Design a protein around this ligand. Structure first.
Ligand code: HEC
Length: 108
């Protein structure tokens, strides 16, 4: 994938509609169904403390950046077979770009 910068404002509405039920982004926000996403960028998958990941997510051992995140959110199970993240995917390029723009800033 090729991340282009988008609207953080729409990315927040995208996050809050499609991600917030399973995730938080603030520093020190609680783990829910999924882990807190603070400092997700520049961190390998499966390394947030306090959350029990799938083996699949740990062994993927992917250093998250803008681009591989875009691929992941298109179809999570396809990028990480075995993941227990039950999310179909953000199919539209512009929605993924909008969200990741928000996510960069919101996870500090
Ligand atoms: C539950 C109904 C979820 C929804 C909706 C979304 N996510 Fe999720 N996510 C969820 C789980 C249970 C997990 C753990 C996966 C595992 O196999 O252990 C995840 C994982 C992620 C990750 C990876 C984080 C890591 O530390 O490796 C990311 C980046 C992530 N989720 C982001 C994310 C976004 C952006 C969502 C909506 C757009 C979203 N998730 C929805 C559970 C659920």
């Amino acid at each position: 994938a090729e991340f282009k910068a988008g609207s953080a404002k729409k990315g927040a509405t995208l996050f809050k509609t499609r991600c917030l039920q399973c995730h938080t982004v603030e520093k020190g926000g609680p783990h829910k169904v999924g882990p807190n996403l603070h400092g997700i960028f520049g961190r390998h998958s499966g390394q947030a403390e306090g959350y029990s990941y799938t083996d699949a997510n740990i062994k993927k051992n992917v250093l998250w950046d803008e681009n591989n995140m875009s691929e992941y959110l298109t179809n999570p199970k396809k990028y990480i077979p075995g993941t227990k993240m039950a999310f179909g995917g953000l199919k539209k390029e512009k929605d993924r770009n909008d969200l990741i723009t928000y996510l960069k800033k919101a996870t500090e």
